């Protein structure tokens, strides 16, 4: 948000985020019609009707899979390794602090 208050804490966790099985879990979408509003999470699975014509459940022109898997390898150097980030937002309200 524009008036965001808090602290961003980032640290490398490649020793912790690497497992012998493989980090196949993480996936991402890189396209959206409009910029996401502040403090918005995109997890709801609605078939995104970007165009005026459905793909009709078949592959073809102008119908590509949006989801992509992150490319992480042990040979990647320091600096691009997966960094864990915690955003601690300290909301300054008028309610009892406690």
From Swiss-Prot:
Changing residue 68 to R: In strain: Omicron/BA.1, Omicron/BA.2, Omicron/BA.2.12.1. Residues 12-83 are annotated as: Receptor-binding motif. Residues 23-31 are annotated as: Immunodominant HLA epitope recognized by the CD8+. Residues 30-65 are annotated as: Disordered. Changing residue 58 to A: Increased resistance to neutralizing antibodies. Binds to host ACE2. RBD also interacts with the N-linked glycan on 'Asn-90' of ACE2. Cleavage of S generates a polybasic C-terminal sequence on S1 that binds to host Neuropilin-1 (NRP1) and Neuropilin-2 (NRP2) receptors. Interacts with host integrin alpha-5/beta-1 (ITGA5:ITGB1) and with ACE2 in complex with integrin alpha-5/beta-1 (ITGA5:ITGB1). May interact via cytoplasmic c-terminus with M protein. May interact (via N-terminus) with host bilirubin and biliverdin, thereby preventing antibody binding to the SARS-CoV-2 spike NTD via an allosteric mechanism. This is Spike protein S1. It comes from Severe acute respiratory syndrome coronavirus 2 (2019-nCoV). The lineage of its organism: Viruses, Riboviria, Orthornavirae, Pisuviricota, Pisoniviricetes. The chain holds residues 426 to 523 of 1273 of the full protein.
